[PDB]
Design a binder for this molecule. Structure first.
Ligand SMILES: O=C(O)[C@@H]1COc2ccccc2O1
Ligand SMILES: O=C(O)[C@H]1COc2ccccc2O1
Lengths: 272, 282
């Protein structure tokens, strides 16, 4: 006997099997279930994911809130017109501890996998779990976390998952700083120098008419002009994060440490 | 793709069985999946029949020698026979993927099983269960059945498959089906064809040892194990890999009153497995 669901209101479920039941019962009456996976502490970047999910005809929006090991977040979802939030406990998600998990391909070891070499296994495992619980038609991820998005596409292809993965463009502050809840930790100096990540990336995107080396040199010059910005990497790759082709579409990714804060950004790049 | 019902439809492309599967489900048929590596025998057909017996069932049997779990060139391949067997059971769908369609990106994203996959069958073959759980996950995602059928012969495999299913929240019921035996007790296996008449006769020691142990078990664990050990020792050219008494989920839990007894042994070059349910004492 299917759990209670009230149209046009924010229905909150904590039990995987509840949200599973409602979702499956909703698809059968012709709603198209959209999944927005989040870790709570919602900002505009999350809201953009929600909005893209809402403009699918017949969409009902599922937003998970789960910290991979509050009333505010729900008021934001309530205010965005979201019908389902899925807010499970660590024990509901992992009732048997860390047992079977997803092992990512070699990409999970590069770039962000450098300092956090198990991070994406964690991410892929929970994403796979969420996809099985909710069974969405479409799943929404921000391009901010670009490597993560490429790995999730890989998970979906690799395990024959029958879901569309949708990548939503990065939401930025007025000066271009990619939104993140870490941005709140930057002191004034750091916050001003932080602009250089997106300025370098945009500078590169336009320098690219002159070829790849010009793009990289433009990005580097800009980063070089900022104080207190320790670049962990600055790399140009193809859109799937393999080696950059001689010309054609690419992606430029950067990561840096400002004090104790690690910021990331990336951007689409055409070569030529 | 076409579906001529009451007939056996063979699809090789993942896409074609996914589409046909979904369509059949959207019309109310209950999709049953029986994954196999072909070279089918009566132990497979009992898996098929359990599936047929579920009402509104449409039966998918998958046949795929998975290069990730492997030795690989030595596996028995008998498709004409396999296919005529399924016609004869009135199986409506055979799913026979190519390696390229299953591994277009080689080994990229794979399943990592729990610590149970390092033990028993997995001790000298630490990657074996990874390949099994990877292809099983993919097959469940392609075919999307209500239920999935496995023999208890490969009991460790069965237990890890239920780990797969619980840990990743798969919305599928796993059905364990009791081991089919030759009239002398020998567990049916595609591997059995590799025993000469001598080894075939010795091979009965495995089920004899287990059934002995199951009845000796009123006298306790040690008696059951000694009973099995005695039978195996009296068998000519049976070399025991392991003989182990475990809890039924095989795991970090102590054996209570209920268990499973597991044996692996070499006859010549052929490895056999068998297992049985043990009740200890009362
Ligand atoms: O043919 C068989 O016995 C095995 C039984 O176990 C299998 C597990 C996954 C995929 C195929 C399988 O085939
Ligand atoms: O809060 C977030 O930004 C997101 C970012 O990506 C996520 C992926 C999987 C589960 C939760 C996630 O939360």
């Amino acid at each position: 006997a299917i759990p209670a669901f009230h149209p046009g209101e924010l229905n909150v479920y904590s039990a995987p099997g509840d949200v599973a039941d409602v979702s499956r019962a909703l698809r059968l009456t012709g709603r198209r279930v959209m999944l927005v996976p989040t870790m709570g502490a919602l900002h505009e970047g999350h809201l953009a994911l929600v909005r893209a999910a809402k403009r699918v005809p017949g969409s009902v929006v599922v937003v998970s809130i789960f910290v991979n090991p509050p009333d505010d977040d729900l008021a934001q979802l309530r205010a965005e017109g979201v019908e389902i939030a899925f807010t499970p406990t660590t024990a509901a998600m992992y009732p048997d501890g860390l047992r079977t998990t997803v092992q990512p391909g070699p990409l999970a070891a590069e770039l962000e996998g450098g300092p956090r070499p198990t991070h994406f296994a964690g991410v892929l495992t929970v994403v796979l779990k969420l996809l099985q619980i909710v069974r969405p038609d479409r799943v929404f991820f921000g391009e901010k976390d670009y490597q993560q998005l490429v790995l999730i596409r890989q998970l979906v292809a690799d395990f024959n998952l029958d879901v569309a993965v949708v990548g939503v463009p990065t939401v930025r502050e007025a000066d271009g700083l990619a939104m993140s809840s870490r941005n709140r930790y930057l002191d004034p100096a750091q916050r001003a120098a932080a602009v250089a990540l997106s300025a370098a990336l945009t500078a590169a995107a336009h320098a690219a008419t002159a070829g790849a080396q010009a793009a990289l040199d433009a990005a580097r010059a800009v980063l070089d002009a900022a104080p207190g910005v320790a670049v962990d990497y600055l790399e140009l790759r193809d859109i799937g994060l393999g080696p950059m082709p001689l010309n054609g579409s690419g992606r430029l990714l950067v990561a840096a440490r400002l004090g104790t804060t690690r910021l990331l950004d990336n951007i689409a790049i055409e070569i030529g």
